[PDB]
Amino acid sequence: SKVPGEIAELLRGFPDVDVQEQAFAFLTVDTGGYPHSALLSRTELEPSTDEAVLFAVVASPRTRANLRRTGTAGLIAIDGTTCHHLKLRMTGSLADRGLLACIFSVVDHKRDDLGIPLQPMLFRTSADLAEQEDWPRTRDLFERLRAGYE
Amino acid sequence: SKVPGEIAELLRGFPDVDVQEQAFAFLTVDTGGYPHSALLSRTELEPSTDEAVLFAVVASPRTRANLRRTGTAGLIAIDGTTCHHLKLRMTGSLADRGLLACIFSVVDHKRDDLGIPLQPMLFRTSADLAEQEDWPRTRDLFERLRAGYEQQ
Ligand code: NA
Ligand code: NA
Ligand code: NA
Ligand code: NA
């Protein structure tokens, strides 16, 4: 399987500052079988060059724990009139202190088009946000993961 | 553990046509252990009068199947600078053709505030949508669910 092309297009690349960006719901499953969520952005999600896998850099401690337990995840991505629902299986990972760089294979993709414009969850990037989230460190871990995968 | 008042305020009431509304991610878990999602709105979510429980009307067949198997769910709600994450346990249900009216107790509420404005997933209602989704049918099912809950 592969990362759907419409989704690779929404996730590829890394945001500039002072621009609205989509916040993507990144879903996991907790110890009690309840759905769990965290919001990620293009800074933390990146398709492989061959688009076969989706890379993620996850800081959230509870999300990391869930991935390490079940290896299952999901993603919600909005574009135009379509709500994309992805199901993901973690096939590999690399830990760096409080960060988990993950490789995911897509297990399912549902395109839910209600035929009406949908606005994604949105936030504005900033220099302070780039500083608080340590954007350069995330970018380095991505390079290490891509090298290992390639 | 009642419905948090902040969450009740975001879900209370039913939209008219031609208004911009939040689409809330309603989360379940599939048989393979993968998170599953459907988008709901204030048309399909409503707090009880005592704010003790959250009512929902769910059409999505796969979401309904997951609820029947686990009785567990989640909700994402965005407001201001906060992303609210709810975990939900189904304590009651009433089925009708293609529709599941559910009663949920909130078992956890997390507020993820990164301190920057966040806008919710948004869509505009319309007469076209109310026709496609059969809003009167959903409203009728809510009334029956509420009657049951209150007659308890
Ligand atoms: Na976040
Ligand atoms: Na990216
Ligand atoms: Na929907
Ligand atoms: Na409502």
PDB file of C-alpha atoms and ligand atoms in Angstrom, chain A residues 112 114, chain B residues 38-40, ligand 3:
ATOM      1  CA  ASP A 112     -15.637  11.131   2.676  1.00  0.00           C
ATOM      2  CA  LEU A 114     -20.048  15.555   1.457  1.00  0.00           C
TER       3      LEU A 114
ATOM      4  CA  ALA B  38     -16.771  10.243  11.673  1.00  0.00           C
ATOM      5  CA  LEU B  39     -17.667  13.960  11.600  1.00  0.00           C
ATOM      6  CA  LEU B  40     -20.677  15.011  13.708  1.00  0.00           C
TER       7      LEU B  40
HETATM    8 NA    NA C   3     -20.262  14.078   8.134  1.00  0.00          NA
END
